[PDB]
Design a protein around this ligand. Structure first.
Ligand SMILES: *[C@H](O)[C@H](C[C@@H]1CCNC1=O)NC(=O)[C@H](CC(C)C)NC(=O)OC1CCC(F)(F)CC1
Ligand SMILES: *[C@H](O)[C@H](C[C@@H]1CCNC1=O)NC(=O)[C@H](CC(C)C)NC(=O)OC1CCC(F)(F)CC1
Lengths: 298, 299
């Protein structure tokens, strides 16, 4: 039985309508056009020559509104400011199709949708999970900076990510819209090292619940590890503090397999699956959220 | 090292603007609005009771233009109605102002396409699937999802290729092409129907192994080769599809320097297990990434 648990993204149409190209002398990349404001990464100010140690404050000073060209494929610039790792460009035309939106900073374990763009043209969408080491996976090539990540609560779009860089290990990171870089990485072309990843406990729990709702509940025993103990246990086993949620609880009351049963399960299962499968996997999966499971097996 | 090889969908905006809701008495599901035409699954005509063998030829005659309500959320007047296989072709009196350039082409097994899952005319999610050789897809579809559509995009042209119709007992799904045929010849009757045996999509498996080589993980490549002809007759007896090359596979061979026939030999050896080794994080072969996927996502 295919559970129907898949990596599902939000319909991107709302966001497509905001994507623009931002050009500065010789660099080009994507930006996000909301009302009168175009957001893009500041390293568009930086020529290739000087990417390992750019002086962003001097670059900005050296700039004028006419340094920035903004074009829309899928506009005159009349203001320019810096906010952390991002540029805030004021343009004379407000985006009509600006959707209701907000800015949030997502925390490790949360999923969001990414609209990968190149040269202002949206080319692909996919879902990622913000790892505990504040990187994400996904697919980003040269020219993808400016691509944006978002959730939806309603028709309200919560913009959470603007893509900036690929680490040496092939994972990725970017800015939240307050201008800070997830995981404190620097926007410089300089070797930098991710912290060690961990497992998102809450997401593992939600996956084992899916398994139960799909009629694959063999791993379920009446042994129950208390929360704070599993927490202690995890600090030493590369696992995240487990925090319950209304979403998680809802899952226990549809399965009748309360959480702590599963925390215990995680311990015995972390060792190994001892010959058996869970939803066609022999390792634990942590990229499905409480919310995905409710939404997708309802 | 993270390949960057992930399940990627096309941006859905083009298709979101074509999605409507179609109502016929008690049945409600999604429809696709292109120019003056609204397409939707024909079992919207069927009352909940008659669904296990309905007489679609007589439901259709019993219907007038007023028997169908069509609402745009993301109301339209039906001025004609016709049946094309398992789908309805309704005419409405307003041309969709957001119709994208488009074609109707049926996909073959192993091809991937994007799905826009919709409930009551409202797009809720998008994901990518692979048409299996048993003519089923996986994905996520709930009560109300019928009429959700699957599509690719080449240039400015959307190719519409799927309109969702049903879930099978094993939890997989199927529907029809926009020429009206059902993939796999399943019927739009509410009866237990058994799907054919699955198989591995040899061309996609090759693509994945090229993807591994591009990611640096080439430990499985030997000089040894097995020829296309010779691979396909081995395939028949081992649950694999015929391998057919494409220009897309050829680019991967040219780029890596590894010939198709080396990877066909590797597939015969890796089928029985990896013996403790991994490939792109897997201990078994992946066949749901296409040559086109790999060229796009690694280049
Ligand atoms: C902006 O489009 C681009 C996105 C990168 C390019 C390849 N994949 C991506 O995600 N970002 C950069 O080019 C940045 C620029 C600095 C100023 C932030 N460079 C970058 O990511 O540097 C990486 C260091 C390690 C590496 F060599 F493996 C790849 C580039
Ligand atoms: C149309 O919206 C609906 C979509 C199904 C419902 C659950 N998941 C889906 O993808 N299609 C149907 O309900 C069809 C209708 C007939 C007339 C073609 N029937 C159907 O899929 O029934 C399934 C049989 C076995 C089952 F119970 F496991 C799931 C329902």
């Amino acid at each position: 039985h295919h559970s129907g648990l898949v990596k599902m993204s939000h319909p991107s149409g709302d966001v497509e309508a905001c994507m623009v190209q931002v050009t500065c002398g010789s660099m080009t990349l994507n930006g996000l056009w909301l009302d009168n404001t175009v957001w893009c990464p500041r390293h568009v100010m930086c020529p290739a020559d000087q990417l390992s140690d750019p002086n962003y404050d001097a670059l900005l000073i050296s700039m004028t509104n006419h340094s920035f060209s903004v074009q829309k494929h899928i506009l005159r610039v009349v203001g320019h400011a810096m906010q952390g790792t991002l540029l805030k460009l004021t343009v004379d035309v407000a985006n009509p199709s600006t959707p209701a939106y907000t800015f949030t900073t997502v925390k490790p374990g949360a999923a969001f949708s990414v609209l990968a763009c190149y040269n202002g043209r949206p080319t692909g969408t996919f879902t990622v999970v913000m790892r505990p080491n504040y990187t994400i996976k996904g697919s980003f090539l040269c020219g993808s900076c400016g691509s944006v990540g978002y959730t939806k609560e309603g028709s309200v779009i919560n913009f959470c990510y603007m893509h900036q860089m690929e680490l040496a290990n092939g994972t990725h990171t970017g800015s939240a819209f307050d201008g800070t870089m997830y995981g404190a990485f620097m926007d410089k072309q300089v070797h930098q090292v991710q912290l060690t990843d961990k497992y998102c406990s809450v997401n593992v729990v939600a996956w084992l619940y899916a398994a139960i709702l799909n009629g694959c509940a063999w791993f379920v025993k009446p042994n129950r590890t208390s929360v704070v103990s599993f927490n202690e246990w995890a600090l030493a086993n590369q696992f995240t503090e487990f925090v319950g949620t209304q979403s998680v609880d809802m899952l226990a009351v549809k399965t009748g397999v309360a959480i702590e049963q599963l925390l215990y399960a995680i311990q015995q299962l972390y060792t190994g699956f001892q010959g058996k499968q869970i939803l066609g996997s022999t390792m634990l999966e942590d990229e499905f959220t409480p919310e995905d499971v409710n939404m997708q097996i309802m």
